[PDB]
DNA sequence: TTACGTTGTATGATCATACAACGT
DNA sequence: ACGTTGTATGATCATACAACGTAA
């Protein structure tokens, strides 16, 4: 049994659901209304048909299975010749189930336009949030109407408990046959197209799933943000058009994937997995000094306290962060198969690998208990998480990021700490820093290989001042004894694949100077293959050029410098304008610890001078709380005393009577005066706090910084043969 | 994978690795010495070689994959020189890979022997556990001396830690060639079958790897067990090995370790451990049945990082079946999502869409956790402690009930009813000498979680009950509406689609033409409706569902092998009246070292009472003595004859105490207290208090978390009926 | 009369996609 | 044309082991 039949055959009532996968097709064939209603489960996301022929429908088994299952040949046919009555799209609320309920909805218009224009075709629309305050269960599709309850919450007690359906598989077979599936209180939506909105719904679609309009994407989302900031509905209708429910359901789900799934934060240079998993390793006790814990419960915590994804995407990410070959400076330090520089993908599994934060990870959590980012509260609403992180140094640049989403990506490379830090107190110092000075002081990435960068600086000018661009890397091509021996292989780059790919030139023979190709790689030498050309009468540079020229020894990397800044838009910026974002992030950030350390001094201060007003009259105190019945008004009134300190006068230890605690807490009181004056001092002035910076930067440049890994010489086009 | 093959193809030395899986594949072959070594990764365990024929084990893929990475076909003979001379076995030290070392030496000599006779049979003895404490790489594996190199770190700085490396995947891949693949450090032990104990070795690998034979093992089960005061001065390196030996002893360890630490549930809590963890780190994580629900990825990950050094398929598995209805008669654990259902078990969701919390049940095993009434071990890791036992409350050994088959011996505990074990065990507790025919006046039998009816005799449930071994029987419940019969009630574990499918096949082959109309009326308010409409109304349908009883799922039978680890510790089958007894005799250890444990609390705290009173009788000559004296502690002591606890406690007193109000109400706990203390030793000194007690306590769990009867039992005919010409 | 199918903790892995952007 | 980079959507397979009941 894959799918789910019913048992009638009339078109009138019949109904089929095509669900995420088998975690809700089980709800869904447990709680179906069955001789009524029928679920087809499918094994995850599906294709974009819109840019294949209507033949060449035929590779993907869900697809097939779709075809086999319905009584519409792929083709036009406009036959009535169904199956099942009712054809309905059963997604999940959340964005991405938005994006594969936009997919199926592709594929039923390039193929099926007869069961829309018929008005056959029905969409779901299912809950993802439950609010249980009391007996008030309220349900809520989206986050926009999860935040309307901030409106008849009028209530001091029974606070709200906000659960998030994952999907359908977090939803009780019930609770979903209510909200989703029984006809007499689920929400339906008829998708229709009509001849009114035809040309319409065909343009949009035509805009949003088309792989040449990513610009026009990119223009629409830029569009709807931007009058979206001056306007940030639902009328209860059984009846809605493609043009509308398509493009909303792709809005949120591009708008989701830029913004909290593949591109980073300027600040913490950390996609929000990333973070999510770095808070909840260092909620877990998990620091450089602890002890090595299995990586199964991290993925665990970060699944069930912050991120409501899978278990792939997070232990790939934990493994990104780990490997050192992936990342320059790795926030994760493993134990166990942790990958191979050959195979990074080769690592073991969270049951047989142990994890721990790295040392450089202290430049994101120091400072993260000092009030110095915003916290929000988590999915089901009983825990917080920060929406940053307080890097003290640009790990944005330093270790850097790739991904790829709707409309937009970014390449960012690694670059070096030290230099990166240099250039950050350059700016400090001067303001009015040309590009141009910055970058003969990083002069470009920094990549975790020996190899070589041979793009030019005019090159690498263009694309530090632009954004975009693209650099090359090669490789150490050092003779020894007379013979070539490569040391450093170029970033993501496999020897066995080195090693293939010259096999295609041993066996083909267009340059018969080789007499073998053997690979001696031990522990002592990561990496040597040994490669014998003919005596030394060939001038074997040239050959090596042309290998450069043909294999991956020589090879190019993207550059798009797209981020999320703190205006909260993604945007493309340049070195001058990362550097600067950053440094008033940094500066925001310091202030916020500043005051944070400053209001809890000058509270311990309070709290010292009202317990030294009660040591000079300890006879008396003890007196008035002997014999009054109510003490602290009386301790208030006497000694003109705030409540707080007549508290802590209270609460003071027979122990702490003594001289020695007197002479003690005289001692804090004065050490916590010398540090209030000098925490004042720095914040009423711009040029000592800038001389902190510079001191924390170049300290932390001293502690945790390391001598650049690729050096950067320029170096000839290559290429040869004809 | 692609077998990794090395460059060269010296037979001399080329030597071939069989992992147990590519996450050890990963670090095998980053350790591997290249052109020397390769490394062939395996799906897990393949299967018990020993008793199937030298041509049915090639196959599709299982050894096929080995017979082509090696070259000689299993005939026997033909050992030629085609891809490696030397063939080792690189299983981990624990339990499940002395397993696999055991299957994989019986495929070896079952169809490879000349590769043994000749010698080209390695076993990899890597290390388990580690300490980490400086710059110098340590690696030992051993269990008799816990100590050893450890105590040549006395000129450097740290204590002692303990790494159990899991299997072979926490070990970095430089660790693993140092460990078992550099030959300048490996410890490899060449598996020689000799030839003057060959009929030894194939007596003991029958006995060992014999579908049949197997049975009958829990003799040597049983007599390692009884010789138990004994042990080996340690085994020391031979550099070469029998496999008599290592077989016996890994097979040992196996079988040992899968009876009493995976199959066997514990005769306390009526728990495997795996299920005791998992409902320990739901407690830990304030899992409550009041609290609010958690993703049970977290339950899992604490799982398996704090105290469960397995998969996690298995633990979530055994979790959904702790917290399906129609599989436990008594849930422990309460849901949200797709659980699965009645119909399909096994079509649950996953962790990652399924929140969990414990049921109210389950405070009957942790309720008294917090006390001083089990025993505690540390976890693997060292750095946590685990319960041994839970203090249940009541005998979740019998209320719920396990299935579970081990090596030797399996164990089929049926479930039965809250209220009636609750009487048998008060019954017992006022009379001691009660026989077992009295108890099943009370305990009518098994309570399977379904409404379904028990068809077995009396007298049969009182020898299965007397014997331990036996088996029971269910039938669905059914009745007649408008002439045609209404099946409301399927036996446990029975799919209704299962049930429909069965009878449409006879409808379809026209075993009974006296059907009208099979119909599935189930619902939500319904959970099953199955309706049989026969042709009219002249049709016997008595003796059509007599025909249905004996062919289809509407009656089945059920195991019933009441083996269980008892107190003692060993495996045993037992009989109701043993299983009572025994559990009797532990919870009153349980509720003994409770009542010590609220003792001792109730002592101390009176000591730090009055202390604390002698203070506030003489508040001016402490503070004065505080004041005045740098160390008051012993000038306390001397002064007012004190306690160093006491003097403590009184240098902790807050200013706020000082008035009398925190006086009146230290003096009414120090009478509260004194009225538990007496109440609490005249407990502890009479039996007939404590048992008293005993009855109250049951009675009263009983009437909190009882509920009726679900399976009533109703004797019915042999059926067997129809089926001939 | 002899071969298959369960129950449940365990050993373990593999399959099809979206999405932007450049080099081959 | 294809093949990458990386967070994301959802699953699929081969076994050990005891003990009885179909069932062919
Ligand atoms: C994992 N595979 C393979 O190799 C090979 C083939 C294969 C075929 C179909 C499959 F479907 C799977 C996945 C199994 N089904 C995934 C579960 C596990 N899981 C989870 C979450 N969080 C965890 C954890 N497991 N493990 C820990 O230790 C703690 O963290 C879920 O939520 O869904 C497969």
Redesign the interface.
């Known amino acids: 049994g894959k799918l789910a039949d019913c ?1 009638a055959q009339d078109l009138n009532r019949t109904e089929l659901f095509l669900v995420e996968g ?3 097709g ?2 869904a ?2 709680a179906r209304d ?1 001789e009524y209603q029928a679920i087809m489960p499918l094994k995850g996301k599906i294709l974009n048909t819109w840019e294949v022929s209507s033949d060449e429908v035929l590779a993907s088994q869900e697809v097939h299975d779709i075809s086999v299952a319905i009584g519409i040949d792929p083709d036009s046919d406009d036959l009535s010749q169904l199956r099942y009555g009712k054809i309905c799209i059963l997604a999940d609320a959340d964005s991405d189930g938005l994006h594969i309920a936009t997919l199926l909805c592709a594929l039923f218009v390039r193929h099926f336009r007869t069961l829309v224009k018929e008005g056959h075709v029905y969409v779901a629309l299912p809950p993802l949030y439950r609010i249980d305050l009391g007996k008030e269960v309220y349900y809520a599709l989206t986050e926009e109407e999860k935040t309307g309850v901030l409106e008849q919450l009028k209530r001091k007690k029974g606070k709200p ?1 906000v ?1 998030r359906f ?9 609770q979903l ?1 209510e909200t989703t599936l029984d006809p007499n209180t689920r929400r339906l939506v008829q998708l229709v197209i009509s001849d009114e909105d035809e040309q319409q719904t065909t343009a949009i679609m035509d805009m949003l799933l088309a792989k040449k309009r990513s610009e026009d994407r990119r223009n629409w989302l830029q569009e709807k943000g931007d009058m979206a900031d001056l306007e940030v509905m639902s009328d209860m209708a059984e009846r809605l058009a493609l043009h509308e429910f398509t493009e909303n359901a792709y809005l949120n789900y591009s708008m989701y994937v830029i913004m909290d799934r593949a591109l980073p934060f300027i600040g913490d240079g950390l996609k929000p997995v990333q973070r999510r998993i770095v808070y909840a390793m260092s909620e877990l006790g998990l620091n450089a000094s602890a ?1 090595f ?2 990586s ?6 970060v ?3 912050y991120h409501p ?3 792939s995407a997070c232990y790939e990410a934990m493994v990104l962060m780990a490997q050192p070959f992936s990342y320059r400076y790795p926030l994760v330090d493993g ?3 942790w ?2 520089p050959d ?1 990074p993908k ?9 994890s721990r934060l790295s040392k450089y990870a202290e430049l994101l959590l120091s400072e993260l208990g000092q009030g110095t980012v915003d916290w929000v509260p988590n999915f ?1 609403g ?1 825990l917080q998480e920060p929406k940053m992180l307080p890097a003290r140094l640009p790990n944005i640049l330093l270790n850097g990021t790739t991904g790829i989403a709707v409309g937009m990506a970014t390449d960012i490379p690694p670059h070096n700490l030290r230099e990166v830090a240099k250039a950050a107190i350059t700016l400090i110092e001067q303001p009015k820093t040309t590009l141009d000075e910055l970058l003969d002081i990083v002069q470009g990435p920094d990549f975790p290989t020996e190899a070589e960068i041979i793009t030019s600086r005019a090159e690498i000018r263009k694309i530090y001042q632009n954004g975009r661009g693209s650099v090359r890397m090669r490789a150490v091509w050092s003779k020894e004894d007379g013979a070539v021996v490569i040391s450093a292989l170029p970033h993501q780059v496999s020897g066995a694949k080195v090693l293939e790919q010259i096999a295609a030139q041993m066996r083909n023979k267009k340059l018969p100077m080789v007499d073998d190709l ?6 002592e030498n990561p990496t040597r293959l040994v490669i014998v050309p003919r005596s030394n009468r060939v001038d074997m540079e040239q050959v090596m050029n042309h290998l450069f020229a043909t294999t991956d020894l020589e090879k190019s990397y993207r550059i798009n410098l797209n981020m999320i800044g703190l205006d909260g838009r993604p945007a493309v910026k340049n070195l001058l304008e990362i550097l600067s974002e950053w440094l008033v992030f940094r500066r925001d950030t310091v202030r916020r610890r500043l005051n944070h350390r400053l209001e809890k001094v000058l509270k311990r201060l309070h709290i010292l001078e009202g317990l030294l007003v009660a040591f000079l009259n300890i006879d008396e ?2 007196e008035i ?2 014999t009054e ?1 109510e ?1 602290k008004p009386a301790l208030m009134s006497r000694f003109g005393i705030s409540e707080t300190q007549a508290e802590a ?7 702490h ?4 605690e007197e002479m003690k807490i005289r001692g804090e009181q004065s050490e916590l005066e010398k540090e209030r004056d000098q925490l004042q001092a720095i914040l009423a002035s711009e040029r000592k706090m800038n001389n902190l910076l510079k001191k924390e930067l170049q300290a932390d440049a001293d502690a945790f910084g390391d001598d650049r890994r690729s050096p950067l010489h320029e170096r000839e086009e290559a290429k040869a043969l004809e």
């Open positions: 048992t088998d975690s809700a089980g709800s064939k447990q069955r408990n659960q994952k999907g359908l598989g977090e939803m009780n077979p019930m046959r002890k814990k299995k199964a419960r991290t993925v665990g915590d699944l069930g306290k994804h899978g278990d134990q166990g198969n990958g191979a195979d080769s690592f073991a599994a969270m049951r047989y690998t142990e089901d009983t053997r690979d001696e790689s031990d522990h105190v003890i709380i002997r019945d003490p006068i209270l609460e003071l230890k027979l122990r009577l003594a001289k020695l």
